[PDB]
């Protein structure tokens, strides 16, 4: 079986599980997406932000 079908019969079949899945993924997703944009935002504005001038003072 593909990952998809293995994914279906484990999680996406029983609705009680299907809601348990989403908060789990969301709970971890919050931990990645913030780190991503905060770094990209840091990266694009390299040499401008407070944390980049946080050591001098």
């Amino acid at each position: 079986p593909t990952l998809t079908a293995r994914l279906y019969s484990l999680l996406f079949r029983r609705t009680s599980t299907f809601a348990l899945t989403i908060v789990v993924g969301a709970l971890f997703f919050e931990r990645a997406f913030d780190q991503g944009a905060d770094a990209i935002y840091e990266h694009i504005n390299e040499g401008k932000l407070w944390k980049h001038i946080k050591h001098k003072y």
Binding site: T4, A5, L7, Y8, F18, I22, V23, G25, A26, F29
Partner: protein, 146 residues
């Protein structure tokens, strides 16, 4: 049926993310603003007077015979110098322990709870000695109440 419903989940994933943040945005508005916090911890204060000054929208009430009182006799066993850091600088939150009023120095008026010069109870509907805040002395002419 897996691929299609997978879309439905991953949608609902992002819905919660946008929802978890935006809701807490408002709820932080109901929280204390930035202006109030700057007046929260700081109180730069400077013998024989009932010094009561407003702080956090609450009062700030500021030894020869005080130590004579027996701690075991007190409703709440607690010594004076446990409460204070300097002996001759009493500090406490002026909250009558019973139901939240303003005691008067040289005393809970709404229930007549007798207090020491230090603020400890002697006669009380007041169960405890009055609340003492955490504080700090930068120098002997200034205080950091907080």
């Amino acid at each position: 049926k897996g691929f299609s419903y997978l879309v439905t989940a991953t949608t609902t994933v992002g819905v919660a993310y946008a929802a978890k943040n935006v809701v807490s945005q408002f709820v932080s508005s109901m929280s204390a603003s930035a202006d109030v916090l700057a007046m929260s911890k700081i109180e730069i204060k400077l013998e024989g007077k009932n010094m009561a000054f407003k702080w956090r929208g609450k009062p700030l009430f500021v030894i020869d015979q005080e130590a004579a009182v027996e701690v075991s006799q007190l409703r709440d066993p607690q010594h004076d110098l446990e409460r204070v850091k300097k002996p001759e600088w009493v500090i406490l939150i002026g909250v009558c322990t019973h139901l939240g009023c303003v005691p008067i120095a040289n005393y809970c008026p709404c229930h007549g709870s007798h207090y020491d010069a230090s603020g400890r109870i002697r006669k009380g509907p007041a169960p405890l000695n009055l609340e003492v805040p955490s504080y700090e002395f930068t120098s002997d002419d200034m205080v950091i109440v907080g």
